[PDB]
Amino acid sequence: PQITLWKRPLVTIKIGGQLKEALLDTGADDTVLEEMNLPGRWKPKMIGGIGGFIKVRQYDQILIEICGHKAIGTVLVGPTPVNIIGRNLLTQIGCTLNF
Amino acid sequence: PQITLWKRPLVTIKIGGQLKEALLDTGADDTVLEEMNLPGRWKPKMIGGIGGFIKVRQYDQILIEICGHKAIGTVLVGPTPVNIIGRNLLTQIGCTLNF
Ligand SMILES: CC[C@H](C)CN(C[C@@H](O)[C@H](Cc1ccccc1)NC(=O)O[C@H]1CO[C@H]2OCC[C@H]21)S(=O)(=O)c1ccc([C@H](C)O)cc1
Numbered sequence: 219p220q221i222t223l224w225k226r227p228l229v230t231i232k233i234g235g236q237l238k239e240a241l242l243d244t245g246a247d248d249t250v251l252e253e254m255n256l257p258g259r260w261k262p263k264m265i266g267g268i269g270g271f272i273k274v275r276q277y278d279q280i281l282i283e284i285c286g287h288k289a290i291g292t293v294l295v296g297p298t299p300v301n302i303i304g305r306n307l308l309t310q311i312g313c314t315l316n317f
Numbered sequence: 318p319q320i321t322l323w324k325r326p327l328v329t330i331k332i333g334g335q336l337k338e339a340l341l342d343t344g345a346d347d348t349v350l351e352e353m354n355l356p357g358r359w360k361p362k363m364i365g366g367i368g369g370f371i372k373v374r375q376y377d378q379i380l381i382e383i384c385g386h387k388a389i390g391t392v393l394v395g396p397t398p399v400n401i402i403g404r405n406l407l408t409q410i411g412c413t414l415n416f
Pocket residue numbers: 243245246247248249250265266267268299300302304340342343344345346347348349364365366367368398399401403
């Protein structure tokens with residue numbers, strides 16, 4: 219589809235058997251999701267943006283479905299105020315910017 | 318143009334007569350630029366990102382050309398990690414997400 223940007227580009231995602239709302243965010247290299255207790259091993263990481271850094275847990279090869287489109291890749295889990303779908307997954311669903 | 322996301326969507330902008338590089342950021346409501354000199358009056362404002370809140374200078378009705386497309390809108394100036402073009406200006410140049 220085509221999503222205009224009058225409002226935040228929020229979409230439903232499925233990850234770890236849960237449905238959630240997340241931003242399609244061309245400004246994020248990677249994907250960052252609200253605290254959730256995923257199984258498996260993880261690696262600590264610190265990521266920075268406006269206001270400074272937050273601590274997150276890096277999970278690799280996680281299955282995620284973004285508005286019907288399947289993808290698999292790294293997800294960072296931590297105290298983010300919004301779920302952020304980054305370019306690592308936006309490429310996998312064929313998402314582009316156009317003007 | 319159509320912009321894929323395997324790389325950061327960085328474009329050249331012109332603001333205040335000077336060229337800069339900026340990131341097309343669909344996850345940003347607002348446009349925030351690193352510290353710079355801009356003519357005209359400004360108002361102190363607060364903005365929140367992934368890591369907390371920062372103080373910025375708000376410039377309204379500022380001419381800014383993005384990848385050859387003209388916009389006139391609000392530009393926030395402050396200690397953002399990188400120059401980001403937010404939805405307030407992406408809508409003006411007709412930018413949409415497509416997949
Ligand atoms: C570096 C360029 C960007 C700043 C990077 N960010 C993406 C960016 O879209 C954030 C998303 C966001 C964050 C909090 C609340 C809403 C939306 N928007 C944002 O800050 O917008 C500001 C201005 O407009 C307002 O609207 C929303 C907030 C205000 S990040 O989240 O910090 C980030 C850093 C590192 C990684 C890993 C390492 O790749 C992934 C993501």
